[PDB]
Symmetry: D2
Subunit: 115 residues, 4 copies
Amino acid sequence: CPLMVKVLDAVRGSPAINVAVHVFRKAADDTWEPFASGKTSESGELHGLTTEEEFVEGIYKVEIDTKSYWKALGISPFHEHAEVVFTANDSGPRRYTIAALLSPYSYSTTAVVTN
Amino acid sequence: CPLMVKVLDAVRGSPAINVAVHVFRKAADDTWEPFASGKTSESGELHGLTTEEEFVEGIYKVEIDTKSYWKALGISPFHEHAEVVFTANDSGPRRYTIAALLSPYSYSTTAVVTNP
Amino acid sequence: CPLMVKVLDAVRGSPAINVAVHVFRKAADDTWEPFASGKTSESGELHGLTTEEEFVEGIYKVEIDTKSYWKALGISPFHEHAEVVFTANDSGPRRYTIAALLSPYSYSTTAVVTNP
Amino acid sequence: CPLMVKVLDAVRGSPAINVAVHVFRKAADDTWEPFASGKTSESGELHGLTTEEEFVEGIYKVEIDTKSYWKALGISPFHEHAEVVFTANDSGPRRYTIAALLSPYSYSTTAVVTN
Ligand SMILES: O=C(O)c1cccc(/C=C/c2ccc(O)cc2Cl)c1
Ligand SMILES: O=C(O)c1cccc(/C=C/c2ccc(O)cc2Cl)c1
């Protein structure tokens, strides 16, 4: 699992369950092409988005549909979504966890990169 | 002003100074049109991006160039930038502060939305 | 002033108003002595806690009463309060802003430390 | 595992390894008595701090020695430590993860509470 996404809910103190997550890879024409997507599990995690072979160096965007999540809970949210844009680099560690902590008017995100 | 951006540095415990910020607005054809840009001052704040007249209802994107900021301090950061995308003014004119707290592999952003 | 506290609400997208704040200083006998207290204003800020003269070198604790804040909005939060403990002024007088961003099961805090 | 602590490093994008963690329980005299402690693992996690039987309702403090961590990396840090104070409550969910994301002048913490 070279890329995992984990989403948490800061309001309810729980995993953020059934959150749509779209992953894109920047193309040569500097456009965002769909790469992988899914919905977070009951533990707020999304695994097996890609494989070691397919996840080559490049710029990736992780888009988390935060707006739908809050709407389903009847909370008026600020952001259209949360986007995390980074370069995957082979030299350094190769396991990537993108974590996001969500609130209606705020989010925080970190990367945990390990070998 | 109706749109201010504030950026802080969690490594140095300081305002994040000289951070480039670009604002875009979604156009009718669904593309991102450049709307405003600037750099944060010595206090980490960016004022004067727009006016109540120009800042109409729409979907806006605030792009904060965090990677340039960290690279000039000797750090190779995780993110290309920090993006904040939101609908503005859809219930009338509001004042928006977009704040961001930066670390090399992490950032946090919040919005303070007030009614004049 | 040399010590300011700022508190924001991540649920409402607003300053956190009327938040009680208590400051303590570690005494020679290793106990926490009450040093200053107040409440945040309509802008989420608490000014005037102390003076450059009184704010000597020491270990300080800023206790933000987050639980009271959330309970009066109808929310049962996780934390009793948010505590910020730090050494101050050990390389000479500085200006400290302690900022906190609050959610019911989470909070984030940072410090902005400047030299006059 | 009724109580788990997870610590992340926002500067290096990694688990915060070998972080001292002290857990206290508020006594009747309103004093903090040692309850459990340990050091985070290579994954930044600290497990088996307590058991279902011993972890009764009450107020607990989790103290994370952030200052030592940053000093060992040669970074001048702001906080003496990070403290997380909460009431454990039986009615609601009974599994507690206290997570902290560390920077030299900032930390963020959240609770994930599940059944
Ligand atoms: O208005 C000000 O003068 C002011 C001063 C100090 C800190 C902050 C905000 C900090 C922050 C920003 C984004 C986050 O996601 C979390 C935090 Cl704590 C704002
Ligand atoms: O809980 C877990 O299993 C887990 C796993 C991986 C990363 C994170 C990061 C969490 C986080 C914690 C506190 C914050 O203030 C912000 C974030 Cl993103 C958490």
